[PDB]
Design a protein around this ligand. Sequence first.
Ligand SMILES: Nc1ncnc2c1ncn2[C@@H]1O[C@H](COP(=O)(O)OP(=O)(O)O)[C@@H](O)[C@H]1O
Ligand SMILES: Nc1ncnc2c1ncn2[C@@H]1O[C@H](COP(=O)(O)OP(=O)(O)O)[C@@H](O)[C@H]1O
Ligand code: ICS
Ligand code: CLF
Ligand code: SF4
Ligand code: ALF
Ligand code: ALF
Ligand SMILES: [Fe+3]
Ligand SMILES: [Mg+2]
Ligand SMILES: [Mg+2]
Lengths: 274, 274, 478, 522
Amino acid sequence: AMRQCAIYGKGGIGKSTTTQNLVAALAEMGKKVMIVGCDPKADSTRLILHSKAQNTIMEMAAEAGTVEDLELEDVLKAGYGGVKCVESGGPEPGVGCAGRGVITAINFLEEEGAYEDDLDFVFYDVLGDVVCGGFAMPIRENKAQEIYIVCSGEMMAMYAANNISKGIVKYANSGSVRLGGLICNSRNTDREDELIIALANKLGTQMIHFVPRDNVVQRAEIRRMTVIEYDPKAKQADEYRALARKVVDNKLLVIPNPITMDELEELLMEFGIM
Amino acid sequence: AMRQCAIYGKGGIGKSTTTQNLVAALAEMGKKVMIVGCDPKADSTRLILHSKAQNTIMEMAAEAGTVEDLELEDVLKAGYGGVKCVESGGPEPGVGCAGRGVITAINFLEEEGAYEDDLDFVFYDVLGDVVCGGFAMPIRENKAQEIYIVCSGEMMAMYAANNISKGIVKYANSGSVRLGGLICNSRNTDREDELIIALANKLGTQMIHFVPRDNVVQRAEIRRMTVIEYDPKAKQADEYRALARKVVDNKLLVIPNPITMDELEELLMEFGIM
Amino acid sequence: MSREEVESLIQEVLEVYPEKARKDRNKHLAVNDPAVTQSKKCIISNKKSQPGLMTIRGCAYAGSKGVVWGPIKDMIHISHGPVGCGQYSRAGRRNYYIGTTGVNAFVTMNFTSDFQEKDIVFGGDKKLAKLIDEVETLFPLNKGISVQSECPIGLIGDDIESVSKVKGAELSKTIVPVRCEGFRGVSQSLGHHIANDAVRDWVLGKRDEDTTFASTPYDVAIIGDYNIGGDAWSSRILLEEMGLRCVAQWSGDGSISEIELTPKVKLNLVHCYRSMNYISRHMEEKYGIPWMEYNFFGPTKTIESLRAIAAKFDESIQKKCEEVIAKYKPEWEAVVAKYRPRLEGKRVMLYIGGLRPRHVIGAYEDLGMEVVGTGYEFAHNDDYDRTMKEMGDSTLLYDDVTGYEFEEFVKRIKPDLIGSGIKEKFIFQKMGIPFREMHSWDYSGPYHGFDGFAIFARDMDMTLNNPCWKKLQAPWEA
Amino acid sequence: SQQVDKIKASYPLFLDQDYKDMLAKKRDGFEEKYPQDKIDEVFQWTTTKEYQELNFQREALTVNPAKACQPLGAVLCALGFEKTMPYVHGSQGCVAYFRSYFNRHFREPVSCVSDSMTEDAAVFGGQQNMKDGLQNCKATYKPDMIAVSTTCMAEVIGDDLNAFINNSKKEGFIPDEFPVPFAHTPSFVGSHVTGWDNMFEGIARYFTLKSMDDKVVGSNKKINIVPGFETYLGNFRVIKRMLSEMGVGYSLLSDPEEVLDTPADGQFRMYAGGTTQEEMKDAPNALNTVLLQPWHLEKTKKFVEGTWKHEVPKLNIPMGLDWTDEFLMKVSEISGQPIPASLTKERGRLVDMMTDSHTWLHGKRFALWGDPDFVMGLVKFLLELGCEPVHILCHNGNKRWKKAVDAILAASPYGKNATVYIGKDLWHLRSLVFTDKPDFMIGNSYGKFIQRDTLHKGKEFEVPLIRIGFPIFDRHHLHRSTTLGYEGAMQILTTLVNSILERLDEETRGMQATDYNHDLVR
Ligand SMILES: Nc1ncnc2c1ncn2[C@@H]1O[C@H](COP(=O)(O)OP(=O)(O)O)[C@@H](O)[C@H]1O
Ligand SMILES: Nc1ncnc2c1ncn2[C@@H]1O[C@H](COP(=O)(O)OP(=O)(O)O)[C@@H](O)[C@H]1O
Ligand code: ICS
Ligand code: CLF
Ligand code: SF4
Ligand code: ALF
Ligand code: ALF
Ligand SMILES: [Fe+3]
Ligand SMILES: [Mg+2]
Ligand SMILES: [Mg+2]
């Protein structure tokens, strides 16, 4: 049991918001979920905890000497739907090493048995710019077995998704992690469905769901809540419920086959006009 | 002459696209500019060179021994309108250490004299997730003088801009680097301009030329060029001309006074509702 | 002298520090009082070093590669990262071994990946795999490969575990990844812990489903003895002279086969509690093997420990132990009768890593020498708890002492002899105080057992009573 | 057992019968080692040419490197300044290792501090570490200057030394005018000599870069001497003596000879001598700057030519006859002083020793390694003596240095059988001395193991080691020797010829077998 998934994608493509709304919909379906935020910004758990995470692994480790003098209950907290939430800390921008922060946080969670429960889903929300091995820590062996990439129809996000696929390939071969599929967070440029499904087909994966872009998400996040908790009768809430159900029953698990820059630009020139 | 600017902001907020369009606008005004991409994704010079910059400092250095064996002409290449383009290299995602690569590339540019005379602008397009000191290499002493933070009305974008300001504070006090202003990329949010203006006032800065969201940008960039090359008479091209003009005539250079999470939430309730 | 004066000395020494550093360092200096039940109220340890204070501590790489893994003879230990760490650690520690270096033994060799800038920027996993292949091609008689991580490996998230697994499966070799990057922990102690965990996870369980080893009831394994100057050997000859079968030695003159055979033994004799108590507890709670701390420093401790170990076996082992004691009695008695008059009443201050600051006090007292000051680089609370029962009344105790602190303590106390490492030796030799290297035995030894005791007494007399110490002041000066 | 009259240390304690029996029983019962025949076969294979081909095809594995990391050289450079504390930003294990290395080489105290960056400092940056470390070091050891280098961790995470030190100054941890020169010294770039160059460039630009306006070249009528990474105290002493005999005003920047040669008189001196800050401030006023070891002072050369505007001469290291002559003539042409009669007589005495010893020196084949400038000087001097430097290895050498040494070898008939290797470690050299055996090898203490290996192939294959270079751990007080100048050439010649003569005496000591050539007069 206990599927472990890692959320990757382009920076600012909506990985944190989408994963938090997905986890809220999952807890709505009676699923015990855990969220690990592998981002130096402790922003992966603002909606679920209804506040900024004030107890990160790195902060509590520095405030108590070393990480070997830390305990699970100091950093692990529960929010909406009983979702247990822990956040990897990290430096303020432009200093330190956030990759090492993520490495230390994941090693602490593993050593302390942060997962040994009646858990059905563990989601690692990673940042956009995977620039070192530490931010690939969630997809190592005995870690997240599925990867979901969040993308959109502007070609920079598509090139990003191709680059994360290139990076993913080495851990897919070295281990058992697999690309479950692509989540499309809408930007509504010209032809988002066609472009994203074509990119997914080229990579050998599916487009598990399409999430529209509406302002109820922003309005809900202003109140520090997920759409599911804010407006359960909203269309976006049902979209997140559909995405959750499609995640639960998903079975496609493929090693990605990234395309070259020339093939990617050919795909854009072919599926990206009118 | 010789104005050194560093483009930062939330991931995927449009730093590279806006930077390239602004650089095209500045070069059409007879100003000699050079773009340094400090992202392991060497995607910050594509719309200027009309192709992906295959040769990067890190890749060339690894192929040709070390960085000392390299030459500027092999990495510094001209493009549309006399815009010199160079890119720091980097590993594929999830491996290595891209911040060290950015440090080494920028040191190589400094040591090789890329910062010659008759160069009005040097723009460092940095990635959105400044995870280490390496990606703060552009704002080191005597490297970049002005910082432009691209933001939007989203809560996450404003939080990222405030976090980046918090990271900037140490370099601003250490050296002479300041925050020129907040370029706004429209995301079509409720009271977007109001939110950006209020956040800029709280930081002690201004919002420089809120940029509208238009698909002419998507089209131009999918045709491997800036909007200026594509449709000079388009509305967004004139907007980029206005942005370039407002950048040239800017004198508000301040050390940001970043606001806490509580003050950020108060800002969101005050200007992010209705 | 006197509990009050040494406290005043501590305060005067601490006076020069900034308030933060003074507040921190006050808790690491104490005056011994056996009226204390828990060292937590007395002295705290195993904490971060104060920056810029010139500490003596090493790193986790030193505690793992330099201390635990390095002494293993038939394994090749690769300092993964830049060139510095392995080069400075190459053959600096005299963990003695028998073998053919470069053919089937590699202890004094320095294997490294020699990271360049491109290895940092683009990762070193492929380079690590190629290095493992080259190690196989050029050293085909090695019986194991360990990858000791340096600081950049820990920083950049190189997946050395994946490389170790894949290459070990491909080559039928034990490849042990040790995440001993130097910035982890505060000292070599976390290096000990990480190395012990690596041994437990990758080596100790290889022969779990194996019963082809004949086991006798008298099987003991020496744990935490690193054969400095042959120490372990000098210890081993005693145990096997009282009937015991020494199946394993950890890890000085150690082979990976002995470590794999350790779970088959019946007793675990731990010399250095600090470095290898982790694996001793693991084996006690998994295989049911009891472990006992012993001490082979000086005749008194050696006899006491031999009788304590014998009491854990049959009557035959006890008779053999008694005959060993009676046989070796005249030799150490002659050593005492020769060297104690030369050393009686001489005061010694010690500063060593984590076991020897308290373990060698009995040996010094066997020669009439009093230990007035002692301290540890990286010991824990339990080590100081054990230290209290061994130190005399109103004796100075220090933890992670700085160069300034230790220099001032020596200036005020004025001991006859100082036992510490290479980084204090010449400082205190220039102050005119005889110095003995208590890590390397000053390139002498062994100091364990009765032969070791003879050597130890000879060295103490040789340095303490050397004529050079009477020539420090020029005759044309007051 | 021990006899109280004659106490045996480990050798020869463990040659006793009971210890030998114990070792044999332990090996038989629990070690499960390869058969002695298998071990002999593998050793013989490792001494072969096919093994050398496999060895030289290595791309990823380094075995027994002949080099160290940059911060070691940075610490050595910083030690050569007056009341200066070396301060390494990063992890403390590095500082412990640097201190132990230099302690074992010099047999002297070596002062150096760390800011003790732990995992939390790695993740969050060591700015707090820098502030507290600078304050603590200044308050505890009262240096007149703290010279800051880096370990690998601080270089990987991009710890901005400039920003950290500036913030420490503005927040009142250290006085604003307290000199804190800094240099980034990544251990994964270059070697220890690169660290020396980087530290010296940082110290130079700290004291000179911002105050060049009131500087005029030659106004002090002195000569700047940059020694580079130097671990022979006699080298500093000989450069000083030769310049002062010449009547030349000089300023030797980074002079560590006093702090590494303090007397034992009941006092410990943490600082002693060293280049004063006023010397570095006045350095741009010098007539010129001469780099003693230019091949690892490239950054210093660029800075001195581009900032101080000194036309740095193209001088090789002043090692051996020709290059000492060139150094003296260049110093003369710069300062205007003539070469005095004492120096001419010293040169003539060097030539006399050369003529006295040429018969034993001529034709001798050598394997040598070390730093590039020292190695090149040794090669040149060996060519001057009629020796053949067959195996010239420099782990931290580069292509341009290799080309220069190849051109030097081509200019002499004794460089015909010589090959220069760069990026090769001492395992490569072990193979080289097995497959193309030289008469001797010259290098640091690590070469002793190679000698051991050669002796295992037989006494006729044994290549004796001559200990010149760094580090030298198994001999005492060799750091006091000299290798530069005529005096250094004389010491090297004496060592070489007497090593040859002692080897020949050993090979002819067998009575009635080889003692017919055991001559009293050589
Ligand atoms: N379906 C969506 N509809 C509208 N806005 C969205 C949607 N998804 C994300 N966003 C908005 O865009 C911003 C993306 O920020 P974030 O979720 O943190 O991305 P990431 O974690 O990948 O960096 C959010 O603030 C959110 O307001
Ligand atoms: N004014 C704009 N109008 C339309 N699209 C934009 C605009 N600015 C940026 N984008 C689009 O948003 C996406 C963000 O990609 P990018 O510019 O590379 O962001 P970043 O450099 O911050 O990572 C791009 O595909 C780009 O086409
Ligand atoms: S392992 Fe430890 S510092 Fe127990 S790291 Fe250190 S060869 Fe010391 S006091 Mo060097 S805990 Fe051994 C030691 Fe003691 S290297 Fe040796 S002498 S008995
Ligand atoms: S605390 Fe320990 S010894 Fe230090 S680096 Fe870290 S593992 Fe190693 Fe290594 S190459 Fe030189 S000595 Fe360092 S600066 Fe890096
Ligand atoms: S790129 Fe990653 S590993 Fe390298 S310094 Fe930045 S956060 Fe650390
Ligand atoms: F804030 Al992001 F990917 F840009 F989590
Ligand atoms: F995703 Al980016 F700069 F390329 F934030
Ligand atoms: Fe000395
Ligand atoms: Mg996120
Ligand atoms: Mg960009």
